[PDB]
Amino acid sequence: STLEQTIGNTPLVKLQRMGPDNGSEVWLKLEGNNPAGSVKDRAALSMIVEAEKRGEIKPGDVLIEATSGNTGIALAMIAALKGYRMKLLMPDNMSQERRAAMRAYGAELILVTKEQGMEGARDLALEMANRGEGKLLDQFNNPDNPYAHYTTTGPEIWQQTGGRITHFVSSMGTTGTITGVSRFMREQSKPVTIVGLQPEEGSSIPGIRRWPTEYLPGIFNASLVDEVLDIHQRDAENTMRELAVREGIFCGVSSGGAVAGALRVAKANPDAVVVAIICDRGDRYLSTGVFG
Amino acid sequence: STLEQTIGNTPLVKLQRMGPDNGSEVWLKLEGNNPAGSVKDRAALSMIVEAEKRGEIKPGDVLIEATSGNTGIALAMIAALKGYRMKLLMPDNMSQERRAAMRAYGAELILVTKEQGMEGARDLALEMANRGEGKLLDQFNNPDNPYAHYTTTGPEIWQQTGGRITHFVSSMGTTGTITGVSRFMREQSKPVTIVGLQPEEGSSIPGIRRWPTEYLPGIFNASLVDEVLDIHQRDAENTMRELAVREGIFCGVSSGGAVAGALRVAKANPDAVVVAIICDRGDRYLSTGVF
Numbered sequence A: 001s002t003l004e005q006t007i008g009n010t011p012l013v014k015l016q017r018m019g020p021d022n023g024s025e026v027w028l029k030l031e032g033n034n035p036a037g038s039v040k041d042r043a044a045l046s047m048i049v050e051a052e053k054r055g056e057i058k059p060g061d062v063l064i065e066a067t068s069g070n071t072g073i074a075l076a077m078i079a080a081l082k083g084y085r086m087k088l089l090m091p092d093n094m095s096q097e098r099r100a101a102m103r104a105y106g107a108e109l110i111l112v113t114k115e116q117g118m119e120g121a122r123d124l125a126l127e128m129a130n131r132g133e134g135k136l137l138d139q140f141n142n143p144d145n146p147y148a149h150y151t152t153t154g155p156e157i158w159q160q161t162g163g164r165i166t167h168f169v170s171s172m173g174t175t176g177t178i179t180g181v182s183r184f185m186r187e188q189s190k191p192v193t194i195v196g197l198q199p200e201e202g203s204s205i206p207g208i209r210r211w212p213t214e215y216l217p218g219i220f221n222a223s224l225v226d227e228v229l230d231i232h233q234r235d236a237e238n239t240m241r242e243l244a245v246r247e248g249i250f251c252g253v254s255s256g257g258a259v260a261g262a263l264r265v266a267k268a269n270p271d272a273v274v275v276a277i278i279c280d281r282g283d284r285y286l287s288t289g290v291f292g
Numbered sequence B: 001s002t003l004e005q006t007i008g009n010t011p012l013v014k015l016q017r018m019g020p021d022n023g024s025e026v027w028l029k030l031e032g033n034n035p036a037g038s039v040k041d042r043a044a045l046s047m048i049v050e051a052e053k054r055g056e057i058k059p060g061d062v063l064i065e066a067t068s069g070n071t072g073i074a075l076a077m078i079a080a081l082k083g084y085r086m087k088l089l090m091p092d093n094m095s096q097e098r099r100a101a102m103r104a105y106g107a108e109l110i111l112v113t114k115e116q117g118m119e120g121a122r123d124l125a126l127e128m129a130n131r132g133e134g135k136l137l138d139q140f141n142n143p144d145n146p147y148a149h150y151t152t153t154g155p156e157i158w159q160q161t162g163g164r165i166t167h168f169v170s171s172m173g174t175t176g177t178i179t180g181v182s183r184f185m186r187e188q189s190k191p192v193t194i195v196g197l198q199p200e201e202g203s204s205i206p207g208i209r210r211w212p213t214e215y216l217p218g219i220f221n222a223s224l225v226d227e228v229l230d231i232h233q234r235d236a237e238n239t240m241r242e243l244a245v246r247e248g249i250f251c252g253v254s255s256g257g258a259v260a261g262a263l264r265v266a267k268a269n270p271d272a273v274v275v276a277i278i279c280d281r282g283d284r285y286l287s288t289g290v291f
């Protein structure tokens, strides 16, 4: 008990109804149990704590990041908790719902133009960190992001399955989760297939993105992901709805996708123990209408 | 784990910046850690599990309840989880955000008329049940509601504080939480002051209400609460906002009220160890603009 100690050690919960019934088990790592409601609390904690250890920041300082989803909420929370001033940059095209989740933790929101977009904010955010007016977290290139999953998430999944896990499935955003977990799994003796997932070409899945072969985050090791699968937006959205109704698991669209991918992996592997990451709870998705 | 095994054993976290600094401590029991995001998951599990123990219901059957908040979410979740078909009753006064939460777990919503409102929903709901149409849950009179807090919530708080708790503060809705934690606290060697909070005269705070001394839930025993302090709606709202900003605790309005109450108690009692229930996360409150 200190909000920090409530980060991680999330439940791992078996699917009881969905999926093939061919010997294969599919377990869900409920990252929505994190204080601020997503897997991001892990990387936000790690990045900040490790920066503190390196003398880079002290409670009074300002932190900076370009983002507007779970990362923003996570950082804003950790900032509120440890006493930092968060500054989050994003395009001026957001629901008052997303903005309010970040604002509630006291984070200052710097809007950018619809036209400089997400790419603009990463650039502006970089400019400010030169200037000395705050520490940039740089979630796509900061080793401490995947170090959080190497250190905690992976060991937890390994401990919670007694080493029986055979496949791991993660929807890829920054890729910290899959990188960090794969890294850990490679250190074990028995093998573990690592399956990443991204949206189909046309698809839009709020946590994640289709990465072109050059723009890849600097954290990513392509050799740590055994296999990459595409997820149609519609299958992720259906699987998400289904999860709530048939399993009691109320999660976001990426998580729907992760279970969809995990199910495809189970259909193709009889005695598998697949572990999928459920990134967040469904709560912050309700106003977008994707339930219905 | 199984989803029902993630109900309870919620964190208990100490206030670091807020509060008086006179030697007192305030600890927050984070009921938002429950799977469906509120303290209501505990009572929902209990009412359904004990109904199962008594053979009144069975995974195919249909459950009924008149509610429009956290209880509905909790029940719909347990129903989706265990195999039941929830039917939930309420006025057509409630927004899409509230309905959507319950509808998502696959619960049917019987909408009812603004007039014959909350009390009418309670009514219509009633006498679908002695038919065999479905098992009514009746969270206001069902002893299994406080039984959940008697066996889990209280014991957890006792264990988590190492017996050091002096005050327990709880915002009263069904009162299941305060009455269940009280029964447990009263069974213990040292005295623990039990502090119920209710909203002030004109104030409205989502999951709670001012109970007139004759409509009190049947589970409520006035002798188990040592004092009842009133909470102004503005103070609950300010404290809720302050918790997110100053502590990183993101919770609802009743939870803000809980903390405001617990701060009052700590201000006045120099070495108190107060625990306050944080009923839920702030997430479902965002679209009301209260943040």
Ligand SMILES: *Cc1c(COP(=O)(O)O)cnc(C)c1O
Binding pocket: A038, A039, A040, A069, A070, A071, A171, A172, A173, A174, A175, A176, A177, A178, A206, A207, A208, A252, A254, A255, A279, A280
């Ligand atoms: C961050 C995020 C992910 C992916 O996590 P990474 O560790 O960044 O790969 C997936 N879904 C949602 C909703 C997220 O916010």
Ligand SMILES: *Cc1c(COP(=O)(O)O)cnc(C)c1O
Binding pocket: B038, B039, B040, B069, B070, B071, B171, B172, B173, B174, B175, B176, B177, B178, B206, B207, B208, B252, B254, B255, B279, B280
């Ligand atoms: C149920 C509830 C309460 C009160 O808990 P009881 O055990 O019913 O007294 C307080 N706040 C909120 C938001 C609730 O849903």
